[PDB]
Structure 1
Amino acid sequence: FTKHICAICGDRSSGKHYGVYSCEGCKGFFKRTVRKDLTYTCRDNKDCLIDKRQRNRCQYCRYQKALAMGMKREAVQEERQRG
């Protein structure tokens, strides 16, 4: 968005992580998740009420949101390019 709020949780973004305005928690979290190629769950339905309140504890839903917008998953493998 104009004001670079974190596309996922509405936090202040640090940069366009994986091509989308994102915050530090999300930066690392998404990287970890993708590199490991993990999946999670939350104590809510898939349509979890994602807002500022939902800290990075809400891994699953943050990941769903990231995927929904379409964070450039592949870019996570940058450091994995051990040429």
Structure 2
Amino acid sequence: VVEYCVVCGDKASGRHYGAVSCEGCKGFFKRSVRKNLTYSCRSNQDCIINKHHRNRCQFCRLKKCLEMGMKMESVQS
């Protein structure tokens, strides 16, 4: 075995874009990069990413994807 997502802590499906991650953070990363979305944090860019609340701040979720080694260049068309 059981690996956990380095982004939100949910059970990871395997490595995606360079990081051990859940289907959730994988899909969120892909769509964020495809559609060239930087988001905006409505609270000081210190939001906690966990399984149950990871959808609260898109900006802090993308920030943690990149901090944890997800690679924009591994997302293709």
TM-score by length of 2: 0.83
Deviates more, 1:63-72 or 1:35-44: 35-44
1-structure distance, mates of 2:37, 2:24: 16
User: How far 1:57 moved relative to its partner?
Assistant: 4.1
Shift of the 53–44 alpha-carbon distance from structure 1 to 2, 3 Å rule, reads farther
Partner of 2:66 in structure 1? 67
Point out 4+ residue stretches in structure 1 off by more than 3 angstroms.
none
Q: Which residue of 2 aligns with 1:32?
A: 31
Alpha-carbon distance between aligned partners in 2 of 1:25 and 1:59, rounded to the nearest angstrom: 12
Instruction: State the match for 1:14 in structure 2.
Output: 13
Letter matched to residue 26 of structure 2? K
SS for the counterpart of 2:20 is strand
Give the secondary structure class of the aligned counterpart of 1:66.
helix
| CA RMSD of superposed structures (Å) | 1.8
Unpaired runs of at least 5, structure 1 = none
Provide the TM-score with structure 1 as the length reference. 0.78
Q: How many residues matched?
A: 77
Paired residue secondary structure (1:25): helix
**3-state DSSP of counterpart to 1:21:** strand
